Every structure is written in C-alpha cells, then in structure tokens.
Amino acid sequence: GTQAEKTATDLPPGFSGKAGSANATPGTKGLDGPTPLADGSFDATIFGPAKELKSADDILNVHRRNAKDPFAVGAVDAPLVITEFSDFECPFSARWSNQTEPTLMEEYVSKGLVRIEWNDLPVNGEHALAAAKAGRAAAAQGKFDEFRKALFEASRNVSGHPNNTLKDFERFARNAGVKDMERFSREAQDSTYDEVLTKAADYAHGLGVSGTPAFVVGTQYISGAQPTEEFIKVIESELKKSPTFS
Ligand SMILES: [Cl-]
Numbered sequence: 001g002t003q004a005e006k007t008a009t010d011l012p013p014g015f016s017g018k019a020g021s022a023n024a025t026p027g028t029k030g031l032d033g034p035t036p037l038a039d040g041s042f043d044a045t046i047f048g049p050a051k052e053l054k055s056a057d058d059i060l061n062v063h064r065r066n067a068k069d070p071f072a073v074g075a076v077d078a079p080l081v082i083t084e085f086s087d088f089e090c091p092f093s094a095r096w097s098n099q100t101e102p103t104l105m106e107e108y109v110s111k112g113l114v115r116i117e118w119n120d121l122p123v124n125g126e127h128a129l130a131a132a133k134a135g136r137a138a139a140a141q142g143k144f145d146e147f148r149k150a151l152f153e154a155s156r157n158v159s160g161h162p163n164n165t166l167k168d169f170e171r172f173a174r175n176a177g178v179k180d181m182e183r184f185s186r187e188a189q190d191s192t193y194d195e196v197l198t199k200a201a202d203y204a205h206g207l208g209v210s211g212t213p214a215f216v217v218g219t220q221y222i223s224g225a226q227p228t229e230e231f232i233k234v235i236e237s238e239l240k241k242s243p244t245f246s
Pocket of ligand 1: 053
C-alpha cells in the first residue's frame, strides 16, 4: 500500500494557510459597487448598524449589508463583513488603508469572501470632521473608495496628522474622479452632512468605540492597525466559524 497517494492531511491552523477561505461560500451579489438612487447619485447619509445592538449577542448587527451603501466594497452576500471605524487624520487609520486593505482586497474582497464597510469615527477634531464631511461628499457621487485612497496615500509618510483642509480635499476629489466639483465643494463645507456625522459619532460611542481604527471582523473586535497577518488569521478563523451567508 506504499505505492499510493492520499489527500493532504489536515494540519493545525498555524500550518494550514487558507482553510477558512477554502471551505467558505463566496457571495455573488453587489460585487459591482453600490446601488445608486433614482438620479444616479448615492445615499451618502448611510451610517449605523443593520439593527439596534442590545447585548454582545447582537454583534453581527454592526454589519449593514445595505446594497445602497456607498461606504462599502465587496459582495452584499459575502460570508464575512469587516466593519471599520476610522478617522481621516489618524496615521493608524492611514496605515491600515495603505498597507493592509490592499492585501484584503486582493485575497478576499475581489473573491466575494469579504465585504468592508466604513464607519466615521472622527476623534482628531476639526480637520477629521471636515475630512469626514468631504468623504461623504465624495460618496454622494460614487467615489468614496477612490477619495479614501487618494487622501490616505497622501498621508503615507506622515507620522502624525496631515492637517488637511478644503483645498486638499478638493485635490483628492479631483484625483478620485468626482465629476461634479461644484456639488463636492459645496457639500464638503455646508451643513449637508453635519447631522449624520453627529449620529455616526454617537452610534460609535454607544458601542464604546473610542479609538481609531477599530474593527468588527465577523464576530471579533480588533482595536488598532494590527499587523496584516493578524487580520488574515482572524478572517480565516471567522470564515471557519461561519462559512456561508444566507
Ligand atoms: Cl446600536
């Protein structure tokens, strides 16, 4: 019986690589981006959970799975959602965007395994609030992800806060391909997004989330820009726990 081959043995997870993703069911819906409103713009007032959280057993409620959400990327039916709370002046938020997120896009989001949902948590004061307003103005025109990447790539060498102001946000919007710069510049400055930013902050504070970036990866809370390999290990563990979304 030595002249035969069997399938690979199962190994302890430290040697298993991608066992959660191997056995998970990819999502197939909402891979092509957010669903627009009737006029072709997007609902940049989306925030919050899918449903009120009352206890720890409600943790999955932080994931919206709202097809209209212009702050989300990846399948609306992905088996795993990453909920992120982030601040555009925060160098740890910048480092996650610049150094971890692209790997997660390549290995999980493009494959329908993971959806990533942004939530505002401005902690750094006036520039962070102004940046969040600009991000919502970009999202209204379907360019949140491109705006986020332009802004955070411009912070890649900054150990503190960039102290971005309106002309910086307008440049990032141009870089992102925002088509209506008059609407962008107006909404980046005026009261349009003041109410939702207050509600988004109050929602995060109600969960006790006070530091950026913060994540709920499936059922698991992660505080801070932990190493890419830690995010991969938690994603694989959470996909093993819950391989399929119905
Ligand atoms: Cl809640």
